[PDB]
Design a protein around this ligand. Sequence first.
Ligand SMILES: O=C(N[C@H](Cc1c[nH]c2ccccc12)C(=O)Nc1ccncc1)c1ccc(N2CCN(c3ccc(C(F)(F)F)cc3)CC2)cc1F
Ligand code: HEM
Ligand SMILES: [Cl-]
Length: 444
Amino acid sequence: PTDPPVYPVTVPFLGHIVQFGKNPLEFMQRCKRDLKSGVFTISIGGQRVTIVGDPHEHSRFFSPRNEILSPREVYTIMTPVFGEGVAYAAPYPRMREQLNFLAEELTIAKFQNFVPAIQHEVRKFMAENWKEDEGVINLLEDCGAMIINTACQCLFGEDLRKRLNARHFAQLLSKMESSLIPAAVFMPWLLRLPLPQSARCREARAELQKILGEIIVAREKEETSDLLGGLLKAVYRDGTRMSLHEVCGMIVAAMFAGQHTSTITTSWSMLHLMHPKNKKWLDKLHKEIDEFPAQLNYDNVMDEMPFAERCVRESIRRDPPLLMVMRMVKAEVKVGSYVVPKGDIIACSPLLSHHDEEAFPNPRLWDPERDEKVDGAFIGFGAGVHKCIGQKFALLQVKTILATAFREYDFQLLRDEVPDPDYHTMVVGPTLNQCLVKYTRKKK
Ligand SMILES: O=C(N[C@H](Cc1c[nH]c2ccccc12)C(=O)Nc1ccncc1)c1ccc(N2CCN(c3ccc(C(F)(F)F)cc3)CC2)cc1F
Ligand code: HEM
Ligand SMILES: [Cl-]
């Protein structure tokens, strides 16, 4: 029968913009607690948003098919970045084929030379930028630079990187990104407001696609196995080749998806590990990595870093970079004793569910040894058919960075406490001006 309870609204135009914008973690716990329901509804500018904040009900968000809970309508703001006809904007079966092709480029089959590529690039960075015996750095910025540099070294052949270096790629992604209005997911009318300067999303994507076109022409001329080369062998079930427009789009998706999420996960991980109270965990990290050779390989990172993986997964559990995942409800869904109606946005919140007292007791505590106490409660990388395809690659990057950085340097946070999360950006990370750290090169 029953609609989920709606948190009381006192200003109709805005709904709960003020309280949700200011502090999503507090506000979502408040609704859940005061409405006495894991499943509840808020308003963003009048759009109903129904949140499935009971982890026992996660599968009611993650299992229904696309024609019932449809991501397309929520992510139409990405069309200028990924492209028309690409990903979400393609018919559902074709979307799935395209994403599957990109997932195959990021599985363990492709990783055998990634660890040394990552390591070589990290060391280049540290040698260029962490030069003296000690120095002060912004860690969130530097981790960001290492994430883009490493991913490019892994995924793009040398011919590509001669036309399109990591800094130039970074600039292209920044222009695509800065054009986006995250709230237009809930309030599409925001696209009608004037901008402070012209957007450059369409020009930046056109330039990327033109570079890739030119690289392809050249490769074809000289007579194969980077990301670009793999996507060029993609053939759909209808017997047609993935187009240049689509290949470009999957490449943007891949770089775009990782750039803030992996950076932030790296940064948080290092921020907890270096905090004085977490000395026991840093010691345990050293036990695990202190017997490694200078030149790490696939086995060391994939098989011999379980504790460091737990550090990374717990940093995501505590402070998930993506606070919510969303679907447009095309046909009503039953969730527990409620029915979520057609036209709602339905969402599952890693932020909310990771603070559930049953699933994660003392959830503001960073405890790499914890396990979820409700199965499937951790949803940092989603679940079901839309689960993260970049998750293995991302974890390979982060763990390689950690093993390399903490081998050569000690770190000290220049404030008393790990940063507050800054909930003001669409991908959520530690507050930037709080991420000053002092490195000290270890006696070798
Ligand atoms: O970051 C995002 N999208 C990119 C791009 C991307 C999207 N689909 C993908 C699928 C695969 C790969 C990349 C992507 C991405 O990189 N996503 C990604 C996806 C999977 N893996 C890695 C990365 C993204 C993040 C958040 C987001 N909102 C969050 C909260 N909102 C909101 C609005 C108003 C209020 C207030 F009014 F104040 F109340 C409060 C909150 C608005 C929406 C929207 C986002 F689009
Ligand atoms: C720590 C880093 C990352 C985090 C925390 C993260 C998180 C997530 C989450 C929560 C989802 C579920 C989205 C939904 O259900 O709507 C997801 C899906 C996805 N992620 Fe990531 N991700 C990360 C890194 C990456 C990387 C490096 C890629 C590179 C390709 C990527 C690509 C994707 C894609 C394509 C999906 C789509 C699944 C779909 O709709 O089929 N992610 N990710
Ligand atoms: Cl386009």
